Design an enzyme around this catalytic site. Sequence first.
Site, PDB file in Angstrom:
ATOM      1  N   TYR A   1      -4.812 -31.137 -28.310  1.00 17.12           N
ATOM      2  CA  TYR A   1      -4.631 -29.772 -27.883  1.00 17.12           C
ATOM      3  C   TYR A   1      -5.640 -29.311 -26.871  1.00 17.12           C
ATOM      4  O   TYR A   1      -5.289 -28.741 -25.873  1.00 17.12           O
ATOM      5  CB  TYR A   1      -4.684 -28.795 -29.102  1.00 17.12           C
ATOM      6  CG  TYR A   1      -4.350 -27.336 -28.729  1.00 17.12           C
ATOM      7  CD1 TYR A   1      -3.020 -26.934 -28.595  1.00 17.12           C
ATOM      8  CD2 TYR A   1      -5.360 -26.368 -28.540  1.00 17.12           C
ATOM      9  CE1 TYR A   1      -2.674 -25.615 -28.278  1.00 17.12           C
ATOM     10  CE2 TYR A   1      -5.034 -25.036 -28.212  1.00 17.12           C
ATOM     11  CZ  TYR A   1      -3.683 -24.679 -28.061  1.00 17.12           C
ATOM     12  OH  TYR A   1      -3.270 -23.347 -27.781  1.00 17.12           O
TER      13      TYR A   1
ATOM     14  N   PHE B   1     -30.186 -25.764 -23.934  1.00 19.28           N
ATOM     15  CA  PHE B   1     -29.063 -26.559 -24.440  1.00 19.28           C
ATOM     16  C   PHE B   1     -27.853 -25.692 -24.692  1.00 19.28           C
ATOM     17  O   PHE B   1     -27.947 -24.644 -25.345  1.00 19.28           O
ATOM     18  CB  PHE B   1     -29.483 -27.288 -25.714  1.00 19.28           C
ATOM     19  CG  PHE B   1     -30.532 -28.350 -25.478  1.00 19.28           C
ATOM     20  CD1 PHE B   1     -30.145 -29.645 -25.083  1.00 19.28           C
ATOM     21  CD2 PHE B   1     -31.897 -28.063 -25.596  1.00 19.28           C
ATOM     22  CE1 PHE B   1     -31.089 -30.635 -24.857  1.00 19.28           C
ATOM     23  CE2 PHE B   1     -32.859 -29.058 -25.381  1.00 19.28           C
ATOM     24  CZ  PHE B   1     -32.462 -30.340 -24.990  1.00 19.28           C
TER      25      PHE B   1
ATOM     26  N   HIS C   1      -7.021 -16.833 -30.712  1.00 19.61           N
ATOM     27  CA  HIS C   1      -6.345 -17.925 -29.993  1.00 19.61           C
ATOM     28  C   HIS C   1      -6.962 -18.397 -28.677  1.00 19.61           C
ATOM     29  O   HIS C   1      -6.745 -19.537 -28.275  1.00 19.61           O
ATOM     30  CB  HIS C   1      -4.833 -17.566 -29.930  1.00 19.61           C
ATOM     31  CG  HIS C   1      -3.998 -18.438 -29.023  1.00 19.61           C
ATOM     32  ND1 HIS C   1      -3.955 -18.255 -27.691  1.00 19.61           N
ATOM     33  CD2 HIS C   1      -3.089 -19.476 -29.314  1.00 19.61           C
ATOM     34  CE1 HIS C   1      -3.106 -19.152 -27.132  1.00 19.61           C
ATOM     35  NE2 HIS C   1      -2.578 -19.907 -28.121  1.00 19.61           N
TER      36      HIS C   1
ATOM     37  N   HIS D   1      -2.119 -15.626 -23.844  1.00 18.57           N
ATOM     38  CA  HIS D   1      -2.125 -17.057 -24.046  1.00 18.57           C
ATOM     39  C   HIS D   1      -3.215 -17.679 -23.226  1.00 18.57           C
ATOM     40  O   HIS D   1      -3.459 -18.876 -23.352  1.00 18.57           O
ATOM     41  CB  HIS D   1      -0.757 -17.647 -23.671  1.00 18.57           C
ATOM     42  CG  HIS D   1      -0.602 -19.138 -23.988  1.00 18.57           C
ATOM     43  ND1 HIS D   1      -0.698 -20.097 -23.042  1.00 18.57           N
ATOM     44  CD2 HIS D   1      -0.393 -19.812 -25.211  1.00 18.57           C
ATOM     45  CE1 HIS D   1      -0.554 -21.299 -23.621  1.00 18.57           C
ATOM     46  NE2 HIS D   1      -0.356 -21.112 -24.941  1.00 18.57           N
TER      47      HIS D   1
ATOM     48  N   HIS E   1       1.582 -25.747 -20.038  1.00 20.80           N
ATOM     49  CA  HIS E   1       0.676 -25.134 -20.965  1.00 20.80           C
ATOM     50  C   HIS E   1      -0.449 -24.335 -20.348  1.00 20.80           C
ATOM     51  O   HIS E   1      -0.941 -23.403 -20.980  1.00 20.80           O
ATOM     52  CB  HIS E   1       0.035 -26.181 -21.888  1.00 20.80           C
ATOM     53  CG  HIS E   1      -0.459 -25.568 -23.193  1.00 20.80           C
ATOM     54  ND1 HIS E   1      -1.744 -25.752 -23.671  1.00 20.80           N
ATOM     55  CD2 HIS E   1       0.163 -24.658 -24.045  1.00 20.80           C
ATOM     56  CE1 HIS E   1      -1.884 -25.044 -24.809  1.00 20.80           C
ATOM     57  NE2 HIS E   1      -0.688 -24.403 -25.049  1.00 20.80           N
TER      58      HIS E   1
ATOM     59  N   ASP F   1     -11.531 -26.998  -6.387  1.00 22.49           N
ATOM     60  CA  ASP F   1     -11.477 -27.515  -4.999  1.00 22.49           C
ATOM     61  C   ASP F   1     -11.397 -29.070  -5.016  1.00 22.49           C
ATOM     62  O   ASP F   1     -12.415 -29.769  -4.747  1.00 22.49           O
ATOM     63  CB  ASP F   1     -12.673 -27.036  -4.156  1.00 22.49           C
ATOM     64  CG  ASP F   1     -12.515 -27.387  -2.648  1.00 22.49           C
ATOM     65  OD1 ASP F   1     -11.403 -27.799  -2.222  1.00 22.49           O
ATOM     66  OD2 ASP F   1     -13.510 -27.302  -1.914  1.00 22.49           O
TER      67      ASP F   1
ATOM     68  N   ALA G   1     -22.407 -74.625  11.687  1.00 16.54           N
ATOM     69  CA  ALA G   1     -21.191 -74.301  10.925  1.00 16.54           C
ATOM     70  C   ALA G   1     -19.931 -74.878  11.532  1.00 16.54           C
ATOM     71  O   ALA G   1     -18.807 -74.682  10.995  1.00 16.54           O
ATOM     72  CB  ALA G   1     -21.054 -72.789  10.749  1.00 16.54           C
TER      73      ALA G   1
ATOM     74  N   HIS H   1     -16.771 -71.820  19.641  1.00 14.09           N
ATOM     75  CA  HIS H   1     -18.012 -71.082  19.256  1.00 14.09           C
ATOM     76  C   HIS H   1     -18.390 -71.460  17.815  1.00 14.09           C
ATOM     77  O   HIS H   1     -17.576 -72.008  17.071  1.00 14.09           O
ATOM     78  CB  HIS H   1     -17.860 -69.547  19.415  1.00 14.09           C
ATOM     79  CG  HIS H   1     -16.823 -68.976  18.490  1.00 14.09           C
ATOM     80  ND1 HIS H   1     -15.503 -69.156  18.706  1.00 14.09           N
ATOM     81  CD2 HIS H   1     -16.934 -68.405  17.221  1.00 14.09           C
ATOM     82  CE1 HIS H   1     -14.784 -68.646  17.647  1.00 14.09           C
ATOM     83  NE2 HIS H   1     -15.650 -68.200  16.742  1.00 14.09           N
TER      84      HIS H   1
HETATM   85 MG    MG Z   1     -28.988 -23.143 -26.706  1.00  8.53          MG
HETATM   86 ZN    ZN Z   2      -9.433 -27.685  -1.659  1.00 10.84          ZN
HETATM   87 ZN    ZN Z   3     -15.546 -67.836  14.629  1.00 12.41          ZN
HETATM   88 ZN    ZN Z   4      -0.042 -22.769 -26.207  1.00 13.31          ZN
END
Ligand code: MG
Ligand code: ZN
Ligand code: ZN
Ligand code: ZN
Lengths: 879, 879
Positions: free
Chosen positions: B21, B93, B141, B201, B323, B329, B613, B695
């Site tokens: 939920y 906190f 709610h 709601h 819901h 952003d 190489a 090369h």
């Molecule tokens: Mg606190």
């Molecule tokens: Zn945006």
């Molecule tokens: Zn090459």
């Molecule tokens: Zn609801």
Amino acid sequence: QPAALPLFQPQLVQGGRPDGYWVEAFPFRSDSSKCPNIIGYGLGTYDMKSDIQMLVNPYATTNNQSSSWTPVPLAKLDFPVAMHYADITKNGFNDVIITDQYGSSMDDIWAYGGRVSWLENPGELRDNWTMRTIGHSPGMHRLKAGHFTRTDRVQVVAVPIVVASSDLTTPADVIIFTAPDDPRSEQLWQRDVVGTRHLVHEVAIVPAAETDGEMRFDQIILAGRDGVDCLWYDGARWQRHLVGTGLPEERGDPYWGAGSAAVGRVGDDYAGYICSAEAFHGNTVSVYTKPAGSPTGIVRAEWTRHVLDVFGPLNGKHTGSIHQVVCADIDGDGEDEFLVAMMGADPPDFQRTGVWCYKLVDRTNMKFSKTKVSSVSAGRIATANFHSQGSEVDIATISYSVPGYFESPNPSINVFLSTGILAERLDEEVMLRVVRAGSTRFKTEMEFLDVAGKKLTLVVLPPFARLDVERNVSGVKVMAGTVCWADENGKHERVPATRPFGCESMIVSADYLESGEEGAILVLYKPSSTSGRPPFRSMDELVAHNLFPAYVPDSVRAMKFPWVRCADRPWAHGRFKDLDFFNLIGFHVNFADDSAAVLAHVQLWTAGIGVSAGFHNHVEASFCEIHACIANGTGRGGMRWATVPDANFNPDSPNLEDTELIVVPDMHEHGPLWRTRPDGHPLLRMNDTIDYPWHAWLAGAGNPSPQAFDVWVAFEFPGFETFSTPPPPRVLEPGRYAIRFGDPHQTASLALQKNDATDGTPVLALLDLDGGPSPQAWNISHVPGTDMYEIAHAKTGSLVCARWPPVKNQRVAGTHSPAAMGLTSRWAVTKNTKGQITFRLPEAPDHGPLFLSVSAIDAIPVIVQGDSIELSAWSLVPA
Amino acid sequence: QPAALPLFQPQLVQGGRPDGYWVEAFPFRSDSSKCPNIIGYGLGTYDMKSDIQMLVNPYATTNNQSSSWTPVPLAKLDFPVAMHYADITKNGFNDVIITDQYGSSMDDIWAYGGRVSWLENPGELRDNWTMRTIGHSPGMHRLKAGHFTRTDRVQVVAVPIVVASSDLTTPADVIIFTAPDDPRSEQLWQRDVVGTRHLVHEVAIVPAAETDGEMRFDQIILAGRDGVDCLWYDGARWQRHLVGTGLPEERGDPYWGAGSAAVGRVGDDYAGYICSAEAFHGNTVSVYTKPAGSPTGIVRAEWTRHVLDVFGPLNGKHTGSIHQVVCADIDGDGEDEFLVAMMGADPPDFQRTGVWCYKLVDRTNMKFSKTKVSSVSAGRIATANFHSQGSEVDIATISYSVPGYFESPNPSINVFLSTGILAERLDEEVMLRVVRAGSTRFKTEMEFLDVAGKKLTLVVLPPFARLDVERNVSGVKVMAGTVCWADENGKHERVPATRPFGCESMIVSADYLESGEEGAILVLYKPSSTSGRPPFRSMDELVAHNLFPAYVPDSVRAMKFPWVRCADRPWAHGRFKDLDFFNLIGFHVNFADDSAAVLAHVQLWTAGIGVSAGFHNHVEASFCEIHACIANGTGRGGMRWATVPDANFNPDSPNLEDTELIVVPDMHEHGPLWRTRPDGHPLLRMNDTIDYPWHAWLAGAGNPSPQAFDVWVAFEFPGFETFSTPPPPRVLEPGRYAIRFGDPHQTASLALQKNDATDGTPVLALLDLDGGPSPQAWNISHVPGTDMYEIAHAKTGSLVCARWPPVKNQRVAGTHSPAAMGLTSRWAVTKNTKGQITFRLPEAPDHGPLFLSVSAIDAIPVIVQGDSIELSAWSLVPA
Ligand SMILES: [Mg+2]
Ligand SMILES: [Zn+2]
Ligand SMILES: [Zn+2]
Ligand SMILES: [Zn+2]
Ligand SMILES: [Mg+2]
Ligand SMILES: [Zn+2]
Ligand SMILES: [Zn+2]
Ligand SMILES: [Zn+2]
């Protein structure tokens, strides 16, 4: 082609479990193995009984929409361990056989527990099945059903690991339980003890039916402190055959021998090798091998142990990370790979978490490679085809998690679905990643789009594989490799592009087609009854439906593919306003391997009567395009291309007299319209774009009353060599030949110096002599989609190739690294009246022809030159 | 550039939940918003209390290795509903504020329930926090904490949805609770009722601090049967401002008005729009707009409702699938997108399951587009940066699942991590999918490989963005776009390739660099202390470590990247035996959009002293390669290329006198060595491969005692135009100009016909007149990595382009669809002594020069021709 591994689509079967230990592929019916259900559960704890959950396979029911696996609890048990299944009641439904009442660990064995029971399948999905006791033995830990001493009752082999709390030295009974005649009454089954073993941790079964007539009954393979051994009953008595003794004993450590073992098929022998993890919960992977020319099977061979891998030291309690090995033919090549179940480690190590797949890469020296296929905890592995009817092998795992002992984070059941095609959302289009067709051994089909009366399907075929079709109805368009079918007019072949300016039907006139030696990748157009029928009189009648199967990601399943008026696309830039001209996107097909290479891009189009899609020439992006028409609105719809210079044609106000028309009827594809050189290589513009004359699809002309849309598919390929202009006569059958130069009087034959497979090895002509080393054989093959041939050494596969650059007097060498588009290793072929063959390289727009030649008239260097026809006539002799 | 959406990496936070939920981003500390924890739970049932789970963010702790979210249960409550957080104890906190004792549905409201309580955060990870009752109201709610009437105490607005079982018509109190001076004693907070509303709601809060000085206190936005309205306290009293009334009432249906509402920032206005879902649990998405030139904020504006989408009919119980809505952003452009939480439907419909992201695409007409970002049930959405310190916005969801009412399969908590880079395993290599840099507004960095003393990092930069670096230590190699930095010698710019045969240091001499107008994509080489230090005397010292962050897939995290002797690679084909020459693979960088286009392939190499190489020329595969040297073994290691024709050099036994050497010192990159045309377009071979002279990389010469490896990175790009040969003088500053032809006496200026943005619109020269429509402005910009310029119409962006083909007298038009490599829309620039400018197209190896020209000496057609210099001299006048 060695076989490559398939891809795997992961799917979470059940997450957020409190624990995990066992996973099993469970077929609900005893007459079918395909799309079984999964049963999983953990050891439970003193605080929670363990739910024996059967998770219903959503793919089992044909025409399925769901990927959700519904859990159905069969029982809730104290401390379950091992399980298997069999048709106990002989009524066509598999019953569950399960052990429980084990206790909480090897230091807490229930003295009156070690129960073996079965759960009666009621023939429908209901929970909480009737449970009946088979028998008991403290420490009961592994079990399998089979036919051990008779074939008219289910039998069960059951084995405790220890007999009592903390007792790691007393051996336990190996027990066989036999079903009564009526298992729904009686109670307690007949029991016979057929051996005693120390610390048995795995029981594996070889079904009699696997043994090609060697065994009447099933063989029991046990992996424990005593190593790996095979017990079997032969109609007369029990016997035992030692496979080997596993990990040597180490001082202060109670675990040695083997933790798990599985029997590996190689070709014709169900037991070409035996793999093993050592010891109990250890980190050692070993394999058992027998000598070349041994009998098939287990008991007649002498086995020898070889350590493959040690994944690290044991912890303070003498345990490691490997819980199980299993053998299965993961790549479909007729040899079993083996899988290793890695529980995890503490401290965490990805190397010891997930599943490793070992593959026998050399039958002769018995060498294996390994590949990681999952990196989340596997306390157990189940193999089956969970998603289709084919011989693919999927892998299910459950995390190993025992609270207050060794716990993996987020314990879960997962399944890895074997496939040649993975689908993924880009933004508005889908990326379809595909295996190379040449090295897969599986057919894969994935429906993707229901449009214009067809279910468009992406199809990967292994070499020489069959695809059944609806004769005269199904259509195919090949994107890689080749397929063909036969009818009364002989063989028909299809490749990515037919001949320049040509047209071919996509319809298969036969009941099946077959891929050629490289396999194929294609779009199959199945008939559909759920996306309209022609004539299509409006775009409403042409609404397309997403067809991706339920096991593809949700983000791909949720995609729609609307037709968008081309005026409204972001690339229109004010063009095409008020035209009945529409576009649907779209699908990339790329190889899934480390090349990630483009195969094709695919999108769709429509045009109402009298509509032109507009003349263009692809200077903006490079590709070789082919169109396949699904539906032709008037019968007259098709491709026009300008036959005058680019400068002499106005695409904004086209003179249609300076064009030619190729009508593309229903279910036909047209050939290349881009500019090509005489041997099929594409002409290229200064900005590296394939050069096209001005060209366009135009609908048949007239007034849209009533309307009838053209619908067609664009296939945009990367650059490739196509067919030749003009088409040369066919003068050479592909096959295996000696390639000889010279008179009946004294020849030399084409040779790869010393048969050396190294890139750059000289090609020569060796004087044929009575002393008589005989001619080297060459495989000559047609290059599909071209009028060219290649010449490959039969022993090493090396291609006959001019060194770079291809100029007069250039040397010829063997190579496995040809130039792109086979520039210096592909050959135009001609035959003279003497019936000798000449091989000519693709001709540079610069230079003259260059032919495969001898350098003089004991070895002669072989070269390319085009001054003398004399030096480049060869006799081909079948070899 | 409109901003594009970022990519999202999905991660399962918690699966296998019994219900779901609520999900909430929960910062553990009140002085930090980044990497918060997640709290989630469901409604519970009569059979199970609901665990209030705080799932610990594994990424919060810098230097993290884990992706596992550890659940910590804060409480176990009967029927919880809504929650929020605040620093109640004022100790740094965040405390949890929660409602419970609701009951099991609107037809089963606990008459003595609707409790509001808080949970005291103890300043460390512990479960089961101290709970204290704030107050009660049946049906409680939704709730939010804030500062409503004072700023020295936490306050909480709390609202019941109904007052009693099945009572859908009586309005409920809107209640404000005020913390006491010591909330750890007392009990029951001060309470004041500030309104009554029907079926509320959703409660949304606008923090005073968001309002740029408009409001002293936080505004409360309520979404219920009464529609959407804003309540606020102004120092003196409560007031109310109606936003609108939402869904009209329908006969036989108890739900109308609004189900949810959120306030959307557009630029400077925190309330540029208000979005809404209607009605309670409905299927209707609407937005509220105010007229152009309204005051900022809510209460001073008049709002008007517009329905955007109706996702389908309600069921028998008058409910649908939406819901919640939330504004955030998502793309970082300074305007809020909004997200819509779709619970699912029965029968199932992907359109009504997951999260839709709506984006305001036209500020003027207030038009929105929508994009699907998740397709698994969202009963609630939380937004935050869950993975880094940046301003990216990740999305967390929980499935909506209430047993025996509306249950989603596999209820789970998921998080979608905003990123410019997604990583995925191919086989041995990694595919890195990246956003286009031009349209992202986020910096993304992903470390991938710790090798040779550097942490190689893939970095996506938006336009004009800054990257802080370690001056004189950090190195960069650009793969797309441009970056630059400044030091005492002025500006330094880096692009995918420097000048042909050139060499540049990768080291940034400044403390930061910035991307240019197209952004950039680059490899950043951070210094490392965990992958060795030079000289590298063995490959052992060069072991590389996987650095992918913990949120990338497990299959990528588990990968190793070994150095493999090149002799042992599958492409060696018998070559390079016994050479100290090694290769490490590898990383594809492709665009993540519907093009899927290649950006670069990246792999690494080493060479011991005296090792070559091997000479090669890339006839096998087409690409434009650049090498960056990390470590130069001797100081003399580098690239040689043959300066003689291909036919005149033997790569197998090279004559080094017929080569030139470009030494590539530590942390330098070299420029192109492939063959190019005078204006930078690549020469192409007949098989469509970029043409290179022979090369090779060769290590410095000598004896490997002691050993010292060269280490270098290959970057393989698709074909592009590079710089010009010889380099032309710089004569033109980019900028915005009128472009005029003719005498001081009477000019014409360059014009796009009627300012028309349509592709193909003629470009002309319009006689400049006293009557006086004034000259059209053109933006002239340097094309990065070339010596060419483009000319883009300042109003429409149309590029000045020759029509195809570029021949003498060819017409010039505006286009947004240039030819690849800008063949007909890029210009070489020269200045005469009169200071006039000439623009010349890339010269075809065929034809003569073609200049942007007038067609005669009221509008003159503009053409390209190269016969007359007179017709192609322009004056540039700043505009
Ligand atoms: Mg606190
Ligand atoms: Zn945006
Ligand atoms: Zn090459
Ligand atoms: Zn609801
Ligand atoms: Mg049965
Ligand atoms: Zn075990
Ligand atoms: Zn196999
Ligand atoms: Zn075309």
